[model samples]
Target chain A: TIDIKSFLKPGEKTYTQRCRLFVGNLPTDITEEDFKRLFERYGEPSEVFINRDRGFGFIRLESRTLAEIAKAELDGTILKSRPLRIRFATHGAALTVKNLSPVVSNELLEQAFSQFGPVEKAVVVVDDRGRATGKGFVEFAAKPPARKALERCGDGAFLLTTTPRPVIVEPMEQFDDEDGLPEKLMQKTQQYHKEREQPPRFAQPGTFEFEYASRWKALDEMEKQQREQVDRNIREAKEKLEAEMEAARHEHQLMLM
Target chain B: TIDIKSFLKPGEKTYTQRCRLFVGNLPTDITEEDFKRLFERYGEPSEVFINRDRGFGFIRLESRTLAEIAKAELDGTILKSRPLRIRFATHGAALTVKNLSPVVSNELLEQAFSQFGPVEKAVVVVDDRGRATGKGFVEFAAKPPARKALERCGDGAFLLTTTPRPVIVEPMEQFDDEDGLPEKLMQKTQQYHKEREQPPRFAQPGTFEFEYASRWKALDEMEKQQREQVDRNIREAKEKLEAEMEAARHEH
Candidate 1:
């Protein structure tokens, strides 16, 4: 039998050293380099990462204070034609939490529970048995936050799933005498303890929002026209760009895969 | 012909005064509140708007300077699980221009073409007509950037599109015999001239992760039993907790 406790580790910063802010809701033509330029005015970002294939990305801030400032000033703001989401550095852990909200993030979870006391750690489980389980954990320096979380999520927030089983939030002290505790309760708290004090480092543990492509199929002519127009524009723009570039500027340029 | 020139206002902010950004590849759950928070950190933003139904938004800075800042900071960041696109905002003014980039934003267009020189404005076209043309208008403060963009994108890129058709750049000196310069060029240039001298205003624009639930599912049998017995032990702990709360209240 695999020891679940062995799977945990302390949380570590994944990307750059600074607190990063990730912004979303962008036009398709926007590139990573362009996105980086958009937020440079608010503060100097350490780096801006973009998924060229997908046309979206993130910005790392040199200062958490600046990140906080960005949150206060930029939240709810619209860019281009769409509204945007701004948030702090995120780990893919929240995606693992069982019955996690589709819209929730790890940062939101931390802030909500941290109000009770000092937070030692926070996490969300995304995988299990070589598959995603959709659950997470949060470790607090004091027990108040944990207690509050249990009271709220475990007792009050009824999921009313297909089975309608009440959510369970158990204490984490069962790890000391794992064999001594009763079968049911021991399994619960032991699992909690196993998750506590560990970082999210599993192999592709959990993921939230695999993709945002709406299945709702609400595209009007504007969206369709917008899509086609944007593609044509980029195509033409790039063509002009290609003619302008000399052999020297083409360094690192390769055939399209 | 749709004569769109009559709507010019007396003292509207010039294209330079207003910049556009393109944002894309967003995670759907992101909210409007989240967008404003991020940009606000850079500076005090003037206006923020978004389409809440879709996960995207537009942010207007009081000055070009702040707009530039937003671009630099957000270029390569990730939100939720998707990357972001940040650049100058665009106006899909004409159907043909709308074809340039099907989902192009003002920010992406400006950034792409602005490298040569400062772009006064770049607007995409989306008409009631069915055509989605990449044809849009790009204005520049200095002549170099506009011309450069025209030269670069003169023909459509990627070999799959049309040639970058060059429109008559404004301020094209007209025949001396005719009525001075084209009234449209004069008006447009004057607009840029006025905006070129304006002051800068700063404001607005604005990440996270976790997995805690998995361990809860991995508890062994003995650990489960201990947790079960804790219900009885909790009564004693509650009394202590109440006493502590009472003491603090009286002392305060």
Candidate 2:
């Protein structure tokens, strides 16, 4: 039943599959001329592209043998002071998540979507004011998982939340849905926000007394629109997957092309 | 007495020792500008030179730490399509071997000299005429081995041959003795000579008669100032060391 080995002498992993290599950790300041000049010696590449700001790129050689030769020599070697990382250059599906609850965190979204596949990133968009704008993104490493995920809790479906709310998750391709605030916000004040959000920092004497959860849940403390009963699951999941990825990190992690 | 490692931290193997790295297998066509441009980012080098035609050179960075960084990153990587071989650069003593039976083979010479230490190369000198000029060179990987070998068989010494003939092995350093022959001989027709001297190729009907060894050993075949009795030891040594090295190769 398992004759996949002897009966099949697989010639190669397919031409295009073996012809491309993903080169990571490139210097943002590196010139295309320099990149081509260094790699051209091993073999002539048919395609080359680099993101100056993102620090990663791709190179497509004419043949698998040529690409292998280049990868054998270039991987783990430095290019303009920073070392390079080379892999087979895989492609996956990315998602744009909307209809997020104001209380929903990146963790809740990732937990809900991870039911799909390996989610590289799951993040809620935030404004420069440090408030979640009720939308986020999820990125999967492979397409089948993403397709299956889209089938389950798509725009027409509802996540089993307390009151049954709407959640819309769409494919991130062709959407271009680039950054608005959260990317910049996290880039600047991630540590500051983490500190401010921690219990010690926020439970000031007047605002948050000991019976805070019950008090806030029952009455709208400030009517405060009150901060509302916080979703503990979203909070926990956000920090856990805060360490992950998804439809983000563009020019650097675009699918296929 | 040989507790060399434990008692000695060795203080970084001396300053210049670790600061330099011998980069080998360089492409002869590689330019110095390209070399310096590539290495400068790893560290500031105090010295750099490439025997472009020879495919090898030296680079002296500011500190051993910096050199280590450069070596860790650059060693085994390619400079110009060809992979590089890098190691801590070392200096050794070389010797020019003289006073032979003319039959001295590289293998025989290597056998005689390797009795001292690791013989990096032991080669017999040959001239354009395709004949041994009764000389060869021996290079030791480390200076002390060369020094000790020089002590055992220097100018005043003689190897233990059948007649105890003279064998002079002198250091190759500072002498710039360079190349004269066998380097060129080996370069062109090593296999040609090996075959021509073989039985099937050389022993023609009349000249041999199968009693040739006895005849040649007794001499005067040519009075023919005929080749004298050949020393079996030298012949054996030459072929063995033929596969070895010494002074030999020079600029491209």
Candidate 3:
């Protein structure tokens, strides 16, 4: 709801094009000051935000022309042994992924999303002490890939490290501009209300009587089949795991003998 | 003598405008293989040459379009901890600089020429053992700057390191498509002959024939004054160096 243009003085140029650049794949050792010093040659940056823990950052230049030049000149440039991936910052394509494994790094999250399309940026959510909080945001080049990733990989679990966790992917309600503020709170409130309205299908009260008996029976039969399939898979997995444990026990017994 | 276009197949594209690029300021640790891997993403390079000892190289892409993209995308890219300086390879605007101090580096040469204008490339000539030969080549972005560098720095010596060496700057003999192979060779041979024919102006064989005449005496007076001015600068520099040496000795 904020009008950024109104604050500008008369005759001042507001570059609406590619002024804000998404700078990613940065090393942890590099700081915002180092980033600014490297890019000040094209033009002075209006804003520079570098999250050292996240290993990515954003730079907003004074003009779109200078940003364009900087983007062309600085893309793929190496900083501290890592090749920097620079692109124009885009909004509305960011996805919030939940239930990441404890060992999941920002680079791992980026590599996972990169299979679908070119990822603009990826950041793992962290706590106050800079410890990662099992949640992350992956931004894509376009909205379609983000939507597609949610449809395909949302329910499916990524096999990363020892623990396999089903990643719950949802569209991130990003705040307006670089300083994520009021809008984030608004989205959070809306999500809370939406979640409160929807209860689990099993928890819903059976208000309908004999009129829906036949339809309910058919639905119950399909659900039964699905449950059986899930049970079978669990049994197979448990059997394999138990066999490995039995083999280990036999090896220990042989050593004792 | 190599006709590069003749080797190309039909229907293949050849981009002539700025296809050859000058890549400089590379770290010695970077090799041609590493440089190729960095640039091969844009397009296949026709030639990739990296002088490891010199810490610079050149890449000629298959087309100018790819070259432009590579230059834009790789100019400030760091290789082996050093940011690369990439630009179009300028041939005609190159100037041969001589009499650099032994300690002068390619970067120092570039810095000296950069004051005049944008330097395309600077290479301090090295011997077989990769030691400085007290000569270098500086290519500029434009012709005027190259000429200006020659005019300014050519007459004056570059005060670098312990020894103050008088720099000799001359326009490089560029070989281009405008003149064919014969003309290039003819010009080179002519230059060789001209240099062989001309002796130093001060060492001409006039002897005492015109040295003692009243008219010659006046000319000799002007030459003597010019020689004295040169001597005064050298004498003053020597005195300053000795005084510093003496002060160091006393302190020790």
Candidate 4:
């Protein structure tokens, strides 16, 4: 096996307990370059993409600490000429809401999440042309805090929050249209095709004029069923034989054949 | 503890594979009732919240499978008289780049995410004002796809669409500014405040009667250190966890 540097791990890579916040709804007069430079006070940004024509883009922070800084100071506060709508970036991710009603805002978001731990960041992502996607993201840097948050925030309910005015906050249930549903069960099943389809056994097999069909077939079957109990004996026997002849196989046929 | 029927195992109180889909950039006239009915075509909606003033709202899907259907059918298409910016919803989960980007059509969103397997649902949330918040959610009905999506889509670069659109094509490099600053990151760090002091934890045990100065002093040092550690740990963990867990971690 080739030794590769893993950046995501501790020594090579440090865990990022912060969030990369996205800012939009800026005044069109503000240039992306200017906007990018202005936010440097928050922290070092890892990636920044801007749409010049649209006068909008996003910035990713190395830490949610930075995001917090940006939001606290910039949110609802005018930058350049526009008041910010800063909140945690909530464009994509799975959502589990509680005390949810029509009234979803920063106050409600914080209220719902604060019960568990201090929320690192929170935001409700709106689409182009301006509207809520009905989604958002929250973070609890500490696992214990997040676990607790999820503990109380789980299940559905109707919630409410008030900013300039009070609004409804209810469970996602309020949106329930009494349909048995084209399909019941609000479950999302995710699968990774590219990763799983990579290699069933070994990467590539050698074409041998030397016939060993049964042996190869057995090896293939054992490798394929490694996760199953029925192949335990086969796997063990194969392992033992391979161990015994490991040096021989490596030095000879395994290399070329 | 909650009776999850056969779906949950012992100690598991909720379904871990839940997903929320957010539809934004609709015509200002769009209503909660219209959006809910539209989403029902794919799966049942668990929650529907309308932004009475902003003229936008959210729709929660019962399953990621249904979310995928919604993504395929609704994203980029004209509904409520506007091009839709479709994405996953991560209401209380950690936030990341996978959520925020140029508003892409649902077809593009699905194509970009199909590599992770079938996406449960994708939401691109916005406030009363219609604009990308640079954060959202995507839920995978299963673990493998969710993991893969996070691996492929969750990264330094923006997961965007290409060609026919909705394709998850990677840019050659992770783009920031010349000095390595992105607008969004800069804004977050410069403006957002770290959550260290807000929620007051128990500093030292107290009662109506003033009593132990010795206990107070001991706690002053120990508790301060402990609280500092707790706050640092909180900031650190949330950095990575929100991105990875937002699209997954649904419960029964």
Candidate 5:
């Protein structure tokens, strides 16, 4: 029998060091040399990793505090004529809000949940037509408030929309990156005493929206086109219905005469 | 013809808000009620989302500052006999350092790269024998240091081990969660703009080593046993050869 506890090494700083940042919107031809130069002011990073042809890269800074500074200062800073988005290197919080009204707005969902506490970020999962996906994520500041919100808001009790639709508030299952860290931790924390601590970083407000818009621009456009097509079809149907109604009204008038 | 440029909405905030956090490793029986009450001290949240069977969830706090405090305070706080993991609600940075020596340790990599800048985290992917996976991620403090390290350390010029093998350092591709943000964004950015901002959060280190050991434990042991068997075979064959040589000498 294998001892799972043998692998447990105490005081391992796996997630505590919050100095990594993700950078996107890079120019295709931009070299790693140029990329390093961009954030040199903040400090020299331990590593600058880029995926060629993907137009993105990750920069691991020296310290967590410095990494925070770099994210604030360099985020949205222009590099090679393209604005760069610098964010904390880890996937922070992710939650799913279900049973949402189709008419719910990302803003409205955010506003409703704001009553519970501080909202780090929120996304009303939208469809191809920019419509609500009826499910979304409202990432809380931390675990406590998130739990509180889930407690008060879950079980489909809290009605968040104009309609009396109960919403099911629960935790969103995080994705297992190809590296397989998230899933592994999820399993090990149950059996092993080796608990990895998540590093905390105060997110700048509106950052998520900005990144979401930029990141999902292509999807938005594609969906927008599809929405237009749907709208056209609706307009034709409505016009036909109106014309038939007009004919029906005329016949009624003729009968009365 | 659809003009892609028309869809560009100026002043749109896509990922600028950093308040969102990803929480994982929850108990299967965990309910939103108990989970919410645990976090009520930090403050009320805008929303609480959860995956029932998967035992994970997310909470959106009202303010970024408060969220930070909550993450600090609540992370590792036990609930229902399980500690909670509260992190920024985004997919964070990841990278792969290839060609590492199989004997390299996580600490060694962190120390070696510390000269460049502060290392957020470093992992030498290990196997069941606690051996290095010949690849790992050394997350830095910021983009500048990461870039500098990549430039100086890449091209297989940096010898991280006693061996002559040159190491290859590159950024690990960020994953797109079930929401499909990262993957969708990747595709969209390629077609629409040169945008490449990585979503933050959901990185659980040490968990990698743990899982790798569990996953490949049996195989690693079997391989070790096979290796020992081969060595014994070689030794026995050598002994027979020597004895035969002695017998020939006596006959002569």
Candidate 6:
């Protein structure tokens, strides 16, 4: 049965290839010429393929670092009315880990797994109330690093917290964007962690006591005002974005006429 | 919010690495000394990490070609009564395509998709009756090629058959070994395709007719017996394997 594989003839690579990036949410009229011009600023692209009908394309640049730079700089930037979504072409082998202690925050989980390689995402799947669902994800840049982290996940020293149970690791059954937790809930979660995670209790110095005491007082005064300001800024942005999007939508639909 | 990523200090590579392979089904008492000696003959291994309690280990060889050579020869070889499973440490981006014509066999699907890059496994997902479930998978060594193939899957030219429906392509939720079909069913499928896929009808020469005519008669005589021989060989191997495994299992 293994001999059946001899039939498939993969293309012989005549040229050296490097990293590829998936460019999404493209305008219907976008051309390769325009695409090349936008991406070439990061580095030279070897091949630029566009499926205009599907509103997406792929670009292979000379190097991975260069492609990453383009991905970082170009993602979410607007070209003609649509915001772009440029991502690494393929970074699969996403591992969804579970059985985490409630005390283990998202960043804590991320930091524990990231020793092997760069974790593209390590987010604790939380409920609408911002409580830990005991499930989290740890996605890697590639498969090798995920393999390494999975191997290390079961070691006695690899505990996420004081939890006695072993952490469960499995291939992802679902894919999701990072920070799936609600925005307000996430802020509260961070605030909760900040207040609870103490530096030391028994042998603590006056500096933390003074900071904490002042922080409690200032939180009602200056910090409360800052918090209100943050909310006010978020509301302001929402209003601004809403009006701008309304106008853009009107114009976008008008062009169909 | 993205600032949370700062805590993860990934290892800065001090040495350039080439390739890694997952060595599975290792002996529970395997030591790094015994492990290194077995793989070093295949190629120079830079790092060898063994989880002896887990009965598995990983080795990073000096080169990918060297690692592949080890994977080819060392896989299924006995090591302390356990058949070693040597696979590439990581190969991501497996895509499952659907809505295929039944005429498309495993090799046909593989050849069609392999034009973009080497398909690690391109199998037509089948049901219990050896019938196409209108599903198949094309796994690649990496993500880039799979992404490229996915983009091309909807271009109208990428149709699996004369069927009008666009082939569906999605990331795999299930990982499977290649050739899920039963052996007898696979042979029948191959024979069916062989008879169905003929040379050109109008411009065909007498050579194909002669070959086909002889094949029709010879199939009942020689080919039928050869088919039986194949079955016999499979039974022989299975019995031999069963006996060997029975003993090995008793010791293992």
Q: By TM-score, who's the top model here?
A: 5
DockQ for every model, please: 0.01, 0.01, 0.00, 0.03, 0.01, 0.01
Tens-digit per-residue lDDT, A1-257, candidate 5: 00111111122122222456888988899799988887776555676898768888888765454565566556787767878876565434446877665545555566778777777556667543344556788766556777777776532246553223346677775432112222233233331222122111122224432222232233334444655655565556546645654565466456663
Residues B1-252 of candidate 4 have per-residue lDDT tens digits of: 011112111112232233467777777766777778777555456667767566566776654434544665567887656788776654332212222234442333445555556654444444333444433444445556655554443222222521111112222221111112112322233112332122312222232111122222333344346555554654464454444443433421
What is candidate 2's DockQ? 0.01
lDDT of 4 by residue, A166-250 (tens): 1122222111111111112222222222222222111122222111222323333443453243235434644554464445435
What is the C-alpha lDDT profile of model 3 across A134-191, one tens digit per residue? 6777777677888888776533333333322235578875322111111222233543
Best by lDDT: 3
Q: Taking the tens digit of each residue's C-alpha lDDT, what string does model 3 give over B110-191?
A: 6667878888567677653345565677777667888878776533333333222235677874432111112122233443
Sort by lDDT, top down from the best: 3, 6, 5, 2, 4, 1
- RMSD values for the candidates in order, in angstroms, are 33.7, 39.5, 39.1, 25.7, 29.0, 31.5
CAPRI-style class, candidate 1: incorrect
- DockQ: which is higher, 2 or 5? 5
Worst 10 residues of 3 chain A by lDDT: A1-10
lDDT of 3 at A113: 84
> Candidate 4 or 6, higher DockQ?
4
| Tens digit per residue, CA lDDT, model 6, A202-240 | 212233333332332332244345445555655565466
TM-score of 3: 0.23
Q: Between candidates 3 and 4, which one is better according to lDDT?
A: 3
Query: How many clashes (backbone atoms < 3 Å, residues ≥3 apart in a chain or on different chains) does model 4 have?
Result: 106
- Give the lDDT of residue B57 in candidate 6: 86
Off by over 4 Å in 4: A1-16, A19-100, A155-158, A161-257, B1-252
Q: Is candidate 3 or 4 superior in TM-score?
A: 3
User: 3 or 5: which has the higher lDDT?
Assistant: 3
Compared with the true structure, what per-residue lDDT tens digits does model 1 show for residues B100-189? 433333444455455556665555443323222444455566545555544443322211111111122232211111111222322334
Judged by DockQ cut-offs, is candidate 5 incorrect, acceptable, medium or high? incorrect
